[PDB]
């Protein structure tokens, strides 16, 4: 809901912290041999029937934000994440809420090689949380099809948890995948 | 005066021209797993995220001339889910219903339901990542949450607020009924909670 610096949010007291990450990789694949995938962005279907980024609650008095994220990624995505290090340099932004509960959400973005993403998908089915906390991994379509709705716009009509949709839109800008006008167009198209 | 999406008999749907045919399936298996050690999964129902950003059931377009509806389905399932599907039966006994539509398409959709063993579902999930359609027509497999969480929205009702292709949402509701997972009044409740 509201922006806040990492350092600032880390000085707070009585707040619940959560760390989530977008793992992505460039791709040369083309849907139907014509529509470039451009980049693979991973999200998941949660136990609560909503889409979200992998990650979760982190007790900052016990462990760092990066340590907590790491532990949650392994449980959710599998041991493939043991070879993947999401660090402080991968940290992007934090948002804060007071109502309904005092919550800080930290968003990380980490680029990987396509083969690493593919290996993560392969081993996610053997993750501890597969079929429970995590109901499956999905890739985010970045393109808009000819009917001007299929793909990204339609995708944004799904049910996202918390500020995950805002985080995705943020990543689309920061990774320079879509310009501000293109984002507005995809948002408009999803609105009708 | 225009027609709308409506139920149609298999025989009738096959006895006409100008309409495209599609076949999709719900593959499912009983499970003893429990979420948070207390919420029974009860059953694993496979759906997927499509290339078009919508949720749907695996399957696709089928040529009524070439092979049977059963045959066309099994072929499409193999491209979407991987080679494990080649060994999967799928007969007329797995056929369930058909819907005809004209609205900006003119299409007939056939829905199938087939029970498999849990390990068979698990195998398909593992092999789906190496299927021809992975990362293309198929953006990932998902399991349908059947339970409703304590806040009375999380789980199936929130799941039902996602973006579903065509009549896949009706097909899912049909399945929850025919498999005796939920009564009609329970189905009406999840819809009500999802619309809230």
Swiss-Prot record, chain A:
GO molecular function ontology, one term from the record: IDP phosphatase activity
pH effect on activity, per entry: Optimum pH is 8.5-9.
Domain of life the protein comes from: Eukaryota
Gene Ontology terms describing biological process: dITP catabolic process; mRNA catabolic process; NAD-cap decapping; negative regulation of rRNA processing; positive regulation of cell cycle process; sno(s)RNA catabolic process
Localization terms from the record: Nucleus; Nucleus, Nucleolus; Nucleus, Nucleoplasm; Cytoplasm
Effect annotated for changing residue 72 to Q: Loss of activity; no effect on RNA-binding
Outcome of swapping residue 71 to L: Loss of activity; no effect on RNA-binding
Record-listed Mn(2+) 3 binding positions: 72, 76, 133
Keywords: Cytoplasm, Hydrolase, Magnesium, Manganese, Metal-binding, Nucleotide metabolism, Nucleotide-binding, Nucleus, RNA-binding
Entry note: cofactor: Binds 3 or 4 divalent metal cations. Acts specifically on U8 snoRNA with magnesium as cofactor. Has broad substrate specificity with bound manganese or cobalt (in vitro).
Annotated substrate binding sites: 20, 46, 53, 163, 167
Catalytic activity: a 5'-end (N(7)-methyl 5'-triphosphoguanosine)-ribonucleoside in mRNA + H2O = N(7)-methyl-GDP + a 5'-end phospho-ribonucleoside in mRNA + 2 H(+); IDP + H2O = IMP + phosphate + H(+); dIDP + H2O = dIMP + phosphate + H(+); a 5'-end NAD(+)-phospho-ribonucleoside in mRNA + H2O = a 5'-end phospho-ribonucleoside in mRNA + NAD(+) + H(+)
Enzyme class: hydrolase
Tissue spec: Detected in ovary, and at very low levels in epithelial cells (at protein level).
Residues engaged in binding Mn(2+) 4: 133
Pfam families named in the record: Nudt16-like
Binding site for Mn(2+) 2: 72
GO cellular component: cytoplasm; nucleolus; nucleoplasm; nucleus
Domain Nudix hydrolase: 22-170
Binding residues annotated for Mn(2+) 1, in chain numbering: 55, 76
Regions that span the bilayer: none
Role: RNA-binding and decapping enzyme that catalyzes the cleavage of the cap structure of snoRNAs and mRNAs in a metal-dependent manner. Part of the U8 snoRNP complex that is required for the accumulation of mature 5.8S and 28S rRNA. Has diphosphatase activity and removes m7G and/or m227G caps from U8 snoRNA and leaves a 5'monophosphate on the RNA. Also catalyzes the cleavage of the cap structure on mRNAs. Does not hydrolyze cap analog structures like 7-methylguanosine nucleoside triphosphate (m7GpppG). Also hydrolysis m7G- and m227G U3-capped RNAs but with less efficiencies.
Assembly description: Homodimer.
Protein known as: U8 snoRNA-decapping enzyme
Organism (species): Xenopus laevis (African clawed frog)
